[PDB]
Amino acid sequence: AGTVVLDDVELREAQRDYLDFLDDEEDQGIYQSKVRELISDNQYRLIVNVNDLRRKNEKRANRLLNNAFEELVAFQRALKDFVASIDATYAKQYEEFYVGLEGSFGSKHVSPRTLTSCFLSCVVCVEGIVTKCSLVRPKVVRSVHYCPATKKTIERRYSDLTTLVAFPSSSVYPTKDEENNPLETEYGLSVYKDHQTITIQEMPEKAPAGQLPRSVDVILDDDLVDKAKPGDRVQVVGTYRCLPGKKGGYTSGTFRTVLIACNVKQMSKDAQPSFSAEDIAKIKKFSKTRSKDIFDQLAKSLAPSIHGHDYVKKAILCLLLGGVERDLENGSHIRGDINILLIGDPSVAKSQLLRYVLCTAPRAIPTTGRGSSGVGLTAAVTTDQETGERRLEAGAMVLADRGVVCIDEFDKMSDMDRTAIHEVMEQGRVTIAKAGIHARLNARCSVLAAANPVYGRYDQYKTPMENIGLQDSLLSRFDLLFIMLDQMDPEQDREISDHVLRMHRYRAPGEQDGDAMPLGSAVDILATDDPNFSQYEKHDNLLHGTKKKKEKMVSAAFMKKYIHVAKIIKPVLTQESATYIAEEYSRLRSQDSMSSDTARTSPVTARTLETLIRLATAHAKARMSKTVDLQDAEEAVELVQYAYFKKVLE
Amino acid sequence: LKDYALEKEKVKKFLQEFYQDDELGKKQFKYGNQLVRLAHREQVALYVDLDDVAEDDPELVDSICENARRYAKLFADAVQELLPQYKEREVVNKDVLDVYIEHRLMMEQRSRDPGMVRSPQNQYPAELMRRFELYFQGPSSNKPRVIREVRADSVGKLVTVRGIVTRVSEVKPKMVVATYTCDQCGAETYQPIQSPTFMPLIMCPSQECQTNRSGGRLYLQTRGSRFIKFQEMKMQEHSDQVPVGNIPRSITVLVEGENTRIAQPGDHVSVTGIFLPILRTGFRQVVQGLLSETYLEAHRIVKMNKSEDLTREELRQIAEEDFYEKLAASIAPEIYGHEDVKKALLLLLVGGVDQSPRGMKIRGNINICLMGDPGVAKSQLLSYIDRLAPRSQYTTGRGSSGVGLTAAVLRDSVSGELTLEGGALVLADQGVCCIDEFDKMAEADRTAIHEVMEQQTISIAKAGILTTLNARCSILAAANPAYGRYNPRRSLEQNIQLPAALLSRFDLLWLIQDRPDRDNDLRLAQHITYVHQHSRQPPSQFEPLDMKLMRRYIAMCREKQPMVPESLADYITAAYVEMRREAWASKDATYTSARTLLAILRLSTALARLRMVDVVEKEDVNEAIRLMEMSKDSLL
Amino acid sequence: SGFDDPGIFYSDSFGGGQARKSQLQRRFKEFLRQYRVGTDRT
DNA sequence: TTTTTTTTTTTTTTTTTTTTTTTTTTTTTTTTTTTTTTTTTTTTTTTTT
Ligand SMILES: Nc1ncnc2c1ncn2[C@@H]1O[C@H](COP(=O)(O)OP(=O)(O)OP(=O)(O)O)[C@@H](O)[C@H]1O
Ligand SMILES: Nc1ncnc2c1ncn2[C@@H]1O[C@H](COP(=O)(O)OP(=O)(O)OP(=O)(O)O)[C@@H](O)[C@H]1O
Ligand SMILES: [Mg+2]
Ligand SMILES: [Mg+2]
Ligand SMILES: [Zn+2]
């Protein structure tokens, strides 16, 4: 053969439609700005919301989603044309520009179980958990060969025939000149694109509870390779395709299918935020208006469904803001995470606070007493069994690096596990070694833990030392230790019960009118978008989640935005704050700090001094202060003074 | 694009007339002298510093870095063609490879007939005749890369990466040029080897056997063939360049030649090399295309921070009477207090001197157990000593237990068989093993540590393994004595809770207790707030030494074997018998044995090493005894 | 690595019954270059 | 310059050979991959005086 096409009508029309869609200037300017932004960010993939195409062109959107390969070829040619129009040299740098897809794939949004053969050559959106990743390998796309005898230089092109027919002429590597002079390959002048394969499995929480998991293979090519690691929950948008078998004279009719990714995005749509100019202005005004009691307002707005526990909510706000790590020049390290332990009577809502943090913070990992044992909590070392090499496996605390581990039923863990937690809790790292490999994994996680005292209910007539069952070294790791009692006072009972009944009465606004909460039975989730991978008035409207209109509460979305901005602040200890903190620490170390019939809940060590510093720093962050002023220090000291002592009754 | 004849002339000019003033402001033609040494077979590897090339041809450096195999070949050819005119005398034929080379050259000139045109396949391959290796020291203008980020866009480029060596194979003969001989003809056949495997030749291609149309079967021979020292190492990302939720990424480094036997497992190295593919033939691959494995082809391996391989004032502070105190106070200056603890840790770093009398080895290593209350910088001191010592390993709790401390037999990858890999106590052999949370260590590990601390070996007689490992490592342990806290209502040996054997193995059991104390708590809190405020320890009388300088001083003190005089024997004996009488008389004392006397002796020899004298003096003994006494001071 | 194929190289013979074709070709060559006509006076 | 026999000589074929071109064409082993056991090295819940 050797035929060329003379202005194919469908490809011409498609490229015209796609370039019309991309050239957004008479329209809102969205994708024209996006293409500028990839030029400036020095990238060559544009992610296109398919809903925008449906809005602009139903016919393109449907044809693209149902005939993915040639449509995507048209739309990448149109993208290259458009990029050249904006900037021809940038378009000259990259051989091809790519298009990823995003948005709402209605029936094309599948799971690895539901990705059947009717989606072949369609765009699909598959969600699952990465079970295995291959190594990132380079695949040669253009080899350059020098002939030392003739001084000639040769280039050979290898087209991407991953899912196409590949005749053997298409894969020969040149080794000889025409008259059998040897060629030497120019590695630096050749072009490679790196290639990866991952397997996506149906998420265990979404799989039918009875049977074995279903998987799909995914080919990742350049820009997309290291986007996912084993254990990650990801969306992969791409084309579902049959791979060719080898040449043979006989075939079973059986084909091996893969998904060729055009886009990979993490479930952590909570690990990447989006700030508009108005959002930033709102944050700045919220911080400037009341730069004194802003912390209290944020704390009291934290777990609105839980009544009470004002100090505990302040402490959780400090944990969510964190301190600042000290990275000394000689490589030494002081941690900047706050670890909190909640001891208390049954049914005082400490699991509710852990659940709130789980649904609120980014990179938050849940774990219960005996459901994460040994190597499931810190890292593990296993042997590859294919290459025979040792590999690392990240446990709960490595996966929560720069995040939170919410350890529920902390008292029901084994002592082996609780002593494995020590190094992560203080030095923020996991050190694991077998013979062929030794690593030091970063686990810079804060620990929010909830436990019951020994005897299940807290005895008020015993010291907190013997109600908590924890040894002093472990207790020292937790910088704040809250005893949450069930004081059966009638007045506090009235407060709690009125609150609880108001939350049991609340009905969502208009969305519901007397109806039930759907179970979400695995075909309903694929019907809509996944909120996990999905795409701000500073206050909530008041109805009866609160009794009366006397004090406003911060919006959850705005609070996420505000805390994300404030977490980056690095306030500095001022000399007055440092002197005050030092004096308070020396007072607190002393016996006069505790009266008679009051007892220490946890020991006061140098870790308590860093606790004061970290709490004061978090308080300063809440105000966006850039300095740790005396008010921050005294707030931290009252937190510590509250948590570290308990009156014992007779 | 570019003419390689012009480029070879460029590199010839650079080699011939590049000069510096390296030896005391003297222009010396840096690469000409090395070419002379290479021509006389007195030097094997030539390292071309691309900084030198950039000094007078920066675009040559850019070409080198963007196609590095080509320029390694061009530089090797230029050196080959320059060597004959830099030869001043006759090589003495150091080895057998030289005998083969000069017999081949002799016979080629003998039957030369120079004007004749030979076949292109009828000469010696260039790599068969070199005896020199050429490597690049990458320009300092190229920033070091992260192993994760060395990808397909850097194939064929000269890159530098940094990492920890996790696994390095033994040096093995990799064949470079296979040599065969014929049963008919008396010529030699040569098969240069680029692939990871080769198919040995069968027939010879000689002219005399092509004329005769004989069988001419050829026989593969190690004798005339050419091999190179070859190692395979794995190298891991540093903890500080791994992304947030990830594990470190390994790269395979193919080390060969004069670059072998530099990196051992656990070393922090910086490797310059070319990033190259290995074709993935054979594997019935899911994806069509030419997929390949990658590796780093090593050019320059440099051991970094703690693995790193003096001015008159320097010797001035070494000879200063306060050198011991200054070094000890440089130990983690961000931890306040712990002055004598830091002195003991310094002695552990220096160590005593091993004695081998009449076939009965007694170690020189010093072991120290810090058993203290919570939050007293034990883990910080352990971590500092791990950062500072040259061969140190840090282990915690039970994350590296069992074969993470001893050895395990593991499937080799290079050939494929069962190779022994050492754990922490082998990677820390002749260094420091920092064992944190010692009281919460699995009992099998504790028994292994018994044998390590006295015999300095690990004996294993499990199924796949029957060996004795060398573990000549000092042990720096940290523990909490009993229930987290020291309580005076109970004796030592009850809140120490170490068996007399294990307890006696430690030269110093340092007790730390943080009893509250208002002015002392203020001093600590001020120190800590300053550290949090400036990311450094507060100014003091004497600025603490750099870790590089501390390492240099400790290393100099290491090869300083001092002896114990006969004159001190009575003084030392009296000190020992005294310590032993308090142990017997006291009712709150730990186990005392002859190991206490050996501890005196090796502590005092470490002090003498710190004074860099060759004879232990009474003040060294005096300070050693004071340290042993302070180690149990907190219980007073 | 496993991309290029250098050739095979061989050397000349380093020395070492019924004459082989190599020896016969050598004798033919020496006849061509050593055959001699004429006489002492001519 | 009317009649008249050899002479070719262009046109039908036919032979006919020599040479180049054309036409035809599954089975059988091997090997990787996956999924199983199985001895051994730990290691995690069992109890006492
Ligand atoms: N202010 C409050 N105090 C106590 N309980 C509350 C409060 N507000 C709500 N609750 C409700 O109490 C119920 C039980 O709380 P939860 O299960 O979180 O208790 P818990 O402390 O985890 O108990 P346990 O220690 O046994 O696990 C929850 O349904 C929660 O909604
Ligand atoms: N002089 C000092 N004494 C005690 N603690 C200090 C001192 N200087 C700093 N610190 C702080 O102590 C904190 C660390 O606790 P550390 O590493 O001491 O635990 P540890 O000694 O191993 O105790 P545990 O027995 O609980 O494991 C560090 O953040 C460090 O900044
Ligand atoms: Mg609970
Ligand atoms: Mg510690
Ligand atoms: Zn031969």
Coordinates of N, CA, C and O in Angstrom, one line a residue, chain A residues 167 326 329 624:
Chain A
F167 N 2.5 -5.0 11.7 CA 3.3 -6.0 10.9 C 4.7 -5.9 11.3 O 5.2 -4.9 11.8
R326 N 10.7 22.2 62.5 CA 12.0 22.8 62.5 C 12.9 21.8 61.8 O 13.1 20.7 62.3
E329 N 19.9 22.9 60.3 CA 20.9 22.8 59.2 C 21.7 21.6 59.2 O 22.1 21.1 58.1
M624 N -3.8 33.9 60.7 CA -2.9 34.3 59.6 C -1.9 35.4 60.1 O -1.8 36.5 59.4

